[PDB]
Design a protein around this ligand. Structure first.
Ligand SMILES: *[C@@H]1O[C@H](CO)[C@@H](O[C@@H]2O[C@H](CO)[C@@H](O)[C@H](O)[C@H]2NC(C)=O)[C@H](O)[C@H]1NC(C)=O
Ligand SMILES: *[C@@H]1O[C@H](CO)[C@@H](O[C@@H]2O[C@H](CO)[C@@H](O)[C@H](O)[C@H]2NC(C)=O)[C@H](O)[C@H]1NC(C)=O
Ligand SMILES: *[C@@H]1O[C@H](CO)[C@@H](O)[C@H](O)[C@H]1NC(C)=O
Ligand SMILES: *[C@@H]1O[C@H](CO)[C@@H](O)[C@H](O)[C@H]1NC(C)=O
Ligand SMILES: *[C@@H]1O[C@H](CO)[C@@H](O)[C@H](O)[C@H]1NC(C)=O
Ligand SMILES: *[C@@H]1O[C@H](CO)[C@@H](O)[C@H](O)[C@H]1NC(C)=O
Ligand SMILES: *[C@@H]1O[C@H](CO)[C@@H](O)[C@H](O)[C@H]1NC(C)=O
Ligand SMILES: *[C@@H]1O[C@H](CO)[C@@H](O)[C@H](O)[C@H]1NC(C)=O
Ligand SMILES: *[C@@H]1O[C@H](CO)[C@@H](O)[C@H](O)[C@H]1NC(C)=O
Ligand SMILES: *[C@@H]1O[C@H](CO)[C@@H](O)[C@H](O)[C@H]1NC(C)=O
Ligand code: NA
Ligand code: NA
Lengths: 367, 373
């Protein structure tokens, strides 16, 4: 390798977005600033389209890359990337939830985002602390049944019930009213940061953020959900964080994304760093770590590939083995992978919203 | 000077589902009606897919667009390729007529591009739920061929989630459901729902039968709409309870000839196997041709419909396509698969499914599910 080139597919907006582009640039600058220079070629996705993602992959492969990162928030498209990466034997580095299918693509990818099973287990751990009550689940879309499959199977067998409602409309109010009528305390919200905020804002207006109710959010952007006027002194609103605020680069990461936001986005208030930005940063380090390790025992070369040819990257299988041996301390905590390419030996901090922000009330361990 | 549509097939030439023949039968029937003045002749250009791949499917669409078509039909059994066709049809504003199960999860931006003659997931779930009602709402086991069955059967799953009855879910490992079936056997729950295609459903029932699990205790409900072609000779006994659905209207005036024509083809070209009866996808393809012709002739009674070559690499759209979608969604047609009508989302509406039980003599009709009731 003359340069250590990888590609990143971004579905992030440039203005008032999650700062994934800057996070990639920060990782690159940090690694290079410390041989072959690291390059990250960035490709934009306008929407979640498998057909258009295929066109993007056909542009990427001829550039000679060692991995493809993302996208973080376009599940159909990410499944297409995994498929094509698998056929070409180029590693796919995932940084968002799979929503949520594929047995045959077992060795196409690794993912830095918590597995669906782990999120299900983490929510179930909280339900255990509640003495396993019946609950309601509010989903942005019906695919939540796939991502929370393990939780759903548990409720399908238990004595406790789970009432599921989909937003699929832009006002949760009527849905919350039905929950209130049911007189069930525990409400699980499965949605991204902005919809989660919308649901809680409307619950607040209906007086449903009082002490009677207990909310569990699945979004890993819980830390950047700022809930003033929504969160009451008596609220029980719990969620998760992957961030290791003790990682040496954490303050610099926060400040850099803050400055970028202040400069380009005057219409909204910077809430703090999005997890997908931190995952992108960590993904660059994971790829570089594995490639440099592989490069110690054998000769790596990159080659232009065509998406429609039968040709593969001869070194891809080996790189995937080295990726799955990586042990890395990142912004999102310890990064190690199991034989499915899922994060293992990591933690999720369990946070509760308070007046001033949030406080840590516990830790979930993947092991 | 003609009303030309294209059909994309993933079906074998011989010993297959008979889709190519069904398309020719629809065209012959429509062109055979005597009208004065003589109306435009119907043509169906047929393209075969050697595989379920965006690359091949895109190439096929690129061959189709310059031919000047008013709609593209199928493929029936390749959801990934069907989604590729929807994408390209949608960009060029040519209606896509779907005749197989929807991709699950659905790609939202492509919903507008098609109408579908195959029952929605919601409808399949409701029909299964209707059978469960007749068993007095029992606990059940669900056997899934694909990880997406919980989404396909969302209504049914949400129902079990608030019910006092339980649902155990087991996914098949991409060629022996035996271990899975032994687990169900130990649970001592009678009702087993199988969500799988025809060949995998047959495999599950065969392995169940080899475990002695097709005796009277067990009650099976199959989601496959090809239930009628499932031949379980040596698997089903008088005492078995194996239930499923049929879309076919055997009282449609062309039904006997449709079946005989597909049979004759089979007894000409497949001296090995025994003709199992008509595949649903073949009947859906037949009905799809009628639906397209009906909508196009109605659109054409006010506007002069022109058809020019388009191309994959050109941004040109067919100027009548978006309007044709409105007419397609308003078609009412009595077909081989029953009443064909659509709701505003392009899904089948106002139709029925027959509820059948397998017997040694084939199967027996035991009820009806009404989509509206
Ligand atoms: C969070 O998820 C919501 C709900 O799925 C997304 O909101 C949709 O966005 C599309 C495209 O902008 C709109 O056409 C829909 O009207 C929205 N639905 C609803 C219910 O609001 C939203 O895109 C996601 N937020 C982010 C930042 O990714
Ligand atoms: C019914 O489903 C099964 C798989 O779910 C299909 O069988 C597949 O056939 C091809 C060719 O051998 C392979 O890609 C898969 O490995 C097979 N799976 C299994 C388990 O056999 C079968 O083709 C489907 N039938 C139709 C017409 O859709
Ligand atoms: C691979 O090894 C060679 C020799 O040690 C070195 O020149 C090259 O920069 C290495 N590549 C990377 C990415 O470290
Ligand atoms: C952004 O930076 C400013 C200036 O230091 C600070 O006041 C603000 O709180 C920062 N935002 C976050 C969320 O850290
Ligand atoms: C966070 O980073 C610090 C500093 O490197 C490290 O000591 C600690 O183990 C990390 N914590 C977690 C939860 O990974
Ligand atoms: C898990 O990660 C920690 C760092 O957070 C590391 O010290 C430890 O060796 C790992 N434990 C196991 C069992 O792999
Ligand atoms: C449209 O109507 C005109 C007038 O009868 C006729 O020439 C033509 O056959 C029709 N076109 C189609 C495709 O039905
Ligand atoms: C197919 O043809 C055979 C031989 O002519 C006939 O006996 C049989 O009834 C037909 N099968 C069906 C399902 O119509
Ligand atoms: C079946 O076809 C007959 C004859 O055209 C028709 O009267 C009847 O309504 C149809 N039944 C269904 C269920 O569509
Ligand atoms: C639904 O279909 C039936 C049976 O073919 C038909 O007679 C009727 O007009 C339709 N009903 C409604 C409410 O449109
Ligand atoms: Na339950
Ligand atoms: Na239940």
């Amino acid at each position: 390798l003359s340069s250590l080139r990888m590609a990143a597919i971004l579905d992030d907006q440039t203005v008032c977005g999650r700062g994934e582009r800057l996070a990639l640039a920060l990782a690159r600058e940090q690694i290079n600033g410390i041989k072959a220079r690291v390059e990250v070629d960035i490709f934009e996705l306008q929407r979640d389209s498998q057909y258009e993602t295929t066109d993007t992959m056909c542009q990427i492969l001829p550039k000679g890359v060692v991995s493809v990162l993302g996208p973080s928030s376009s599940p159909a498209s990410a499944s297409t990337v995994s498929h094509i990466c698998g056929e070409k034997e180029i590693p796919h580095i995932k940084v968002g939830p799979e929503e949520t299918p594929l047995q045959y693509l077992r060795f196409a990818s690794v993912s830095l985002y918590p597995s669906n099973e782990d999120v299900s287990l983490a929510v179930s751990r909280i339900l255990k602390s509640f003495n396993y009550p019946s609950a309601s689940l509010i989903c942005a879309k019906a695919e939540c049944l796939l991502r929370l499959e393990e939780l759903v199977r548990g409720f399908l067998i238990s004595k406790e019930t789970l009432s599921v409602r989909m937003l699929d409309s832009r006002d949760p109010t009527p849905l919350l009213k039905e929950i209130r009528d049911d007189k069930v305390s525990t409400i699980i919200i499965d949605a991204n940061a902005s919809i989660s905020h919308l649901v809680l804002r409307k619950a607040s207006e209906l007086g449903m953020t009082s002490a009677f109710y207990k909310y569990i959010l699945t979004t890993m952007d819980f830390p950047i959900l700022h809930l003033d006027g929504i969160v009451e002194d008596s609220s029980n609103i719990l969620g998760f964080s992957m961030f290791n605020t003790s990682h040496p680069f954490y303050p610099e990461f926060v400040r850099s994304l803050n400055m970028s936001w202040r400069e380009n986005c005057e219409a909204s208030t910077y809430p703090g760093p999005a997890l997908s930005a931190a995952l992108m940063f960590d993904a660059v380090h994971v790829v570089v770590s594995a490639v440099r390790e592989l490069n110690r025992s054998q000769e790596i070369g990159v080659k232009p590939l065509a998406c429609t040819s039968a040709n593969i990257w001869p070194h891809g299988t080996s790189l995937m083995n080295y990726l799955r041996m990586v042990e890395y301390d990142g912004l999102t905590g310890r990064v190690e992978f199991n034989s499915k390419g899922q994060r293992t030996n990591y933690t999720l901090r369990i946070l509760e919203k308070s007046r001033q922000g949030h406080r840590e009330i516990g830790v979930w361990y993947s092991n």
